[PDB]
């Protein structure tokens, strides 16, 4: 029956980051099938404000892709993650933004 393909995820900032400086946090989720998916952006384990979900697309290997993003102002103490749940994962997976200042 139906192909199951696990999401591949990258978490990255729009600009090179500076502590205390407003930026945009990106979570790009790709390579998954079927399209049903849950993607969430979290700040210290809590849902982030002002999250935007672009419309989904797909590639010629029949897998789907979606960008999720939000403004953020990273500090040296805050932890930002992208949590992704999909039926091709055995468990929901969290992906941490690496604080690169």
């Amino acid at each position: 029956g139906q192909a199951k393909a696990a999401p591949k995820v990258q978490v990255y900032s729009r600009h090179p980051a500076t502590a205390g400086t407003e930026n945009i946090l990106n979570c790009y989720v790709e390579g998954f099938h079927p399209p049903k998916i849950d993607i969430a952006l979290l700040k210290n384990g809590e849902p982030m404000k002002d999250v935007k979900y672009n419309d989904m697309s797909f590639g010629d290997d029949w897998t789907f892709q979606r960008l999720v993003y939000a403004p953020f102002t990273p500090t040296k103490s805050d932890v930002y993650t992208c949590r992704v749940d999909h039926e091709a994962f055995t468990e929901p997976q969290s992906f941490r933004w690496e604080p690169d200042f």
């Binding site: 090179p16 399209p35 989904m56």
Partner: protein, 270 residues
């Protein structure tokens, strides 16, 4: 190169953020049109489409979209039964379009998928479909027996598609030919006696990019990795590359970025 591509996807049942039927069109890798399932209309997704001035252009695309939406509902029911599948959220996919290469030569594509797997692939130069399994063979035979399916697609891919691609590339030229230089940052982190250098390019346009590493001015491929290119919210792109080096040697390395915005590939250090 230049490319026009249309992507169609259907799903048996919707889910959050996943419509039952979708169409997205791309020129040179950038979205330019998309179906709105609620209004049932093809819509512009980039401002230069106002230069598409032919009368009834949007109405014609909308009519094709609505017809295809009905066909996709039929196909999902047909293929569930042909493959003796249980009911569930099945998917179906079509992608087609054309390329104009650097030498002016053309390519054309039409590929069909079902449930995340290859189903049929068109070869316009032999006017035949390649079936991925015995179930897809049934459609191959149907289409090859109708007798005009392949001929009409080959004409579209070699004429209509290419004619419209040339028009879109001209209408979109000021957006498609713009150059945004990436902001590049090289950083390093050490673990288990290995210093990993990361080179991140933020906000480049257009999409093609190549990243490599120089050690004391020489190419170094040992222990290098790279991510896939991914988009930002403004239509520019992002990529990372890494290299593993000896702790203490970070100053010997440069990230080398090949990109259309850089007439000479740029070099960056941590």
């Amino acid at each position: 190169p230049h490319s026009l591509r249309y992507f169609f996807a259907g799903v048996s049942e919707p889910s959050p953020g996943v419509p039952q039927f979708m169409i997205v069109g791309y020129v040179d890798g950038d979205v330019f049109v998309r179906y709105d399932s609620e209004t049932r209309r093809m819509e512009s997704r980039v401002d230069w489409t106002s230069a598409i001035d032919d009368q009834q252009y949007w109405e014609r695309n909308t009519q094709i979209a609505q017809n295809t939406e009905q066909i996709f509902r039929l196909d999902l029911e047909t293929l569930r039964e042909r493959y003796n599948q249980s009911r569930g959220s099945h998917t179906t996919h079509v992608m087609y379009g054309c390329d104009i290469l650097e030498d002016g030569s053309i390519r054309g594509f039409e590929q069909h998928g079902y449930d995340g797997k290859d189903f049929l692939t068109f070869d316009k130069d032999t006017l035949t479909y390649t079936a991925a399994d015995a179930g897809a063979q049934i459609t191959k035979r149907k289409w090859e027996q109708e007798g005009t399916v392949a001929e009409r697609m080959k004409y579209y891919l070699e004429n209509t598609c290419i004619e419209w691609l040339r028009k879109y590339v001209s209408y979109g030229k000021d957006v498609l030919e713009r150059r945004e230089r990436p902001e590049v940052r090289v950083s390093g982190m050490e673990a288990d006696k290995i210093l990993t250098l990361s080179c991140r390019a933020h906000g480049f346009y257009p999409q093609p990019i190549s990243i490599s590493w120089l050690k004391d001015g020489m190419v170094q491929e040992q222990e290098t990795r790279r991510g896939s290119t991914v988009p930002n919210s403004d239509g520019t792109y992002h990529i990372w590359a890494t290299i593993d080096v000896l702790p203490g040697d970070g100053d010997k390395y440069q990230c080398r970025v090949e990109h259309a915005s850089l007439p000479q590939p740029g070099l960056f250090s941590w």
